[PDB]
Enzyme design. Structure first.
Site, PDB file in Angstrom:
ATOM      1  CB  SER A  36      17.760  73.379  45.235  1.00  0.00           C
ATOM      2  OG  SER A  36      18.760  73.402  44.188  1.00  0.00           O
ATOM      3  CE  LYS A  39      21.509  75.854  44.227  1.00  0.00           C
ATOM      4  NZ  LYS A  39      21.279  74.410  44.288  1.00  0.00           N
ATOM      5  CB  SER A  99      18.263  76.755  42.149  1.00  0.00           C
ATOM      6  OG  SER A  99      17.282  76.826  43.137  1.00  0.00           O
ATOM      7  CE  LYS A 202      15.812  78.642  46.795  1.00  0.00           C
ATOM      8  NZ  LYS A 202      16.670  78.840  45.577  1.00  0.00           N
TER       9      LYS A 202
END
Length: 344
Positions: A36, A39, A99, A202
Site C-alpha cells: 500500500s 497509494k 487505502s 502511510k
C-alpha cells in the site's frame, strides 16, 4: 555521527524533510514490494490533478464493475457499490485514510480513462522526482515482481506530497473515515501517540517481506523528519521502530536555514563591467542538518569558482559555493549566485 539506533527492519531510512539529509539508513536503495505505500504515488497524481484544476473534488464518479468493492474481496477497500455515484473528495479520502483498493481504480479511471494509462502518469512522476529504484504497475500496490520501490524513493515521494500538496497532506492525519455506513480507522497507530507529533503518512504489508510504514513528525521548532521502514516482522513493531528513528532523530540532530531566497549576503568586486561590485546570495532557501547543540560552531566560507569575477554577469548565475564546516570538516555546501545583472 553518534550511535544509530538498532532497528528491526529489512530496510529503512530517516531523513530531514527540509534539508534532504539522510540521518541514518539500512539498504536505503534495496528494492522492496511497496504494497500500500504505492497509494502515496496514486494520491500524488490525484492531488496534482486537483491542484491544476483538471478534476474537482466535487466530481461525481460512477462506480461500475471495475471499481466495485466486490473485486477486492480479501484486501482493503472503501466499499464502493455498483451503480452509485461518489465524489472525488470521498474517493481520495478513502485512498488516503483507509487505502481503499476500489477507490484507487475508481480514481485512476476518472483521471486517466483507464488504469494502465493512469499508472503511466505515476511513472511519469517517478522520473520527474529522480528515482532510480521505483516502478509501478498498479494504482493500489498489489504485489507484482515488476512493481517495486525503496525506502529512500518512498521518503522522496512522501516529501513531495508534503511539499507540493500541503492541502492534500492534511488528510493523512485523519484518524478514521466513514463511507457507505462503514467506519474504518487510519492504520498509522502513531497518529494516536500524544508524546510525538506524527501527522503522516502511510502503511502497508506484503508477504514478500513484512510490514512497512512511512511516517513523518514535526517539532515545535518546525524541524520535520520522515522515516521509512520496510520488511518489519509485526504490525505493531513497525510503529515502534519508526518512533525509535524519529526520537533518535529529534534527540540528536537539528536543522537550520543557512540561506534565505533572494537575500543578498555578500558584495564582491567585479572586473571590467558596468558596476564595480556585485551582490551575491541564493535565489532559494537552504537548510542543513547538524548534531544538536552545534549551530554556533558551524563556519561558512566561499569558493568562488574563479579568483575574481569578470563581467558580463547574469542574475541567477552560479559563480561558486558556500561551504559549511564543523570542527574542521566540511559538512554541507550550497550554490552561491550573482543577484543582479552586470553587463559590458
Amino acid at each position: 555521527g553518534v550511535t544509530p539506533p538498532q532497528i528491526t527492519a529489512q530496510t529503512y531510512v530517516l531523513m530531514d524533510y527540509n534539508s534532504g539529509a539522510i540521518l541514518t539508513a539500512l539498504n536505503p536503495d534495496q528494492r522492496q514490494y511497496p504494497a500500500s505505500l504505492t497509494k502515496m504515488m496514486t494520491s500524488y497524481v490525484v492531488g496534482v490533478a486537483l491542484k491544476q484544476g483538471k478534476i474537482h473534488n466535487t466530481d461525481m464518479v460512477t462506480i461500475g464493475e471495475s471499481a466495485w468493492g466486490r473485486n477486492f474481496p480479501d484486501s482493503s477497500k472503501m466499499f464502493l457499490d455498483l451503480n452509485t455515484q461518489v465524489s472525488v473528495a470521498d474517493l481520495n479520502r478513502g485512498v488516503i485514510v483507509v487505502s481503499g483498493n476500489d477507490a484507487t481504480v475508481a480514481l485512476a479511471e476518472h483521471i486517466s480513462g483507464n488504469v494502465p494509462n493512469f499508472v503511466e502518469t505515476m511513472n511519469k512522476y517517478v522520473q520527474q522526482f529522480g528515482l532510480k529504484n521505483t516502478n509501478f504497475t498498479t494504482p493500489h500496490g498489489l504485489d507484482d515482481p515488476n512493481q517495486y520501490s525503496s525506502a529512500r524513493d518512498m521518503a522522496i515521494i512522501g516529501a513531495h506530497i508534503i511539499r507540493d500538496l500541503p492541502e492534500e497532506y492534511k488528510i493523512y492525519s485523519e484518524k478514521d473515515f466513514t463511507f457507505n455506513k462503514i467506519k474504518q480507522p487510519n492504520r498509522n497507530g502513531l497518529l494516536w501517540d500524544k508524546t510525538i507529533n506524527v501527522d503522516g503518512m502511510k502503511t502497508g504489508h506484503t508477504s514478500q517481506a513484512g510490514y512497512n510504514l512511512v511516517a513523518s513528525a514535526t517539532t515545535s521548532n518546525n524541524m520535520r523528519l520522515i522515516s521509512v521502514v520496510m520488511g518489519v516482522p509485526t504490525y505493531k513493531g513497525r510503529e515502534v521502530e519508526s518512533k525509535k528513528l524519529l526520537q533518535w532523530g529529534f534527540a540528536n540532530f537539528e536543522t537550520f536555514k543557512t540561506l534565505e531566497a533572494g537575500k543578498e549576503i555578500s558584495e564582491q568586486r567585479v572586473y571590467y563591467g558596468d558596476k564595480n561590485s556585485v551582490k551575491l546570495g541564493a535565489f532559494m532557501d537552504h537548510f542543513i542538518t547538524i548534531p544538536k547543540g552545534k549551530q554556533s560552531e558551524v563556519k561558512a566560507r566561499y569558493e568562488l569558482a574563479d579568483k575574481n569575477l569578470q563581467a558580463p554577469l547574469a542574475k541567477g548565475q552560479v559563480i561558486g559555493k558556500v561551504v559549511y564546516a564543523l570542527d574542521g570538516k566540511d559538512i554541507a555546501s550550497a550554490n552561491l549566485q550573482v543577484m543582479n545583472d552586470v553587463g559590458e
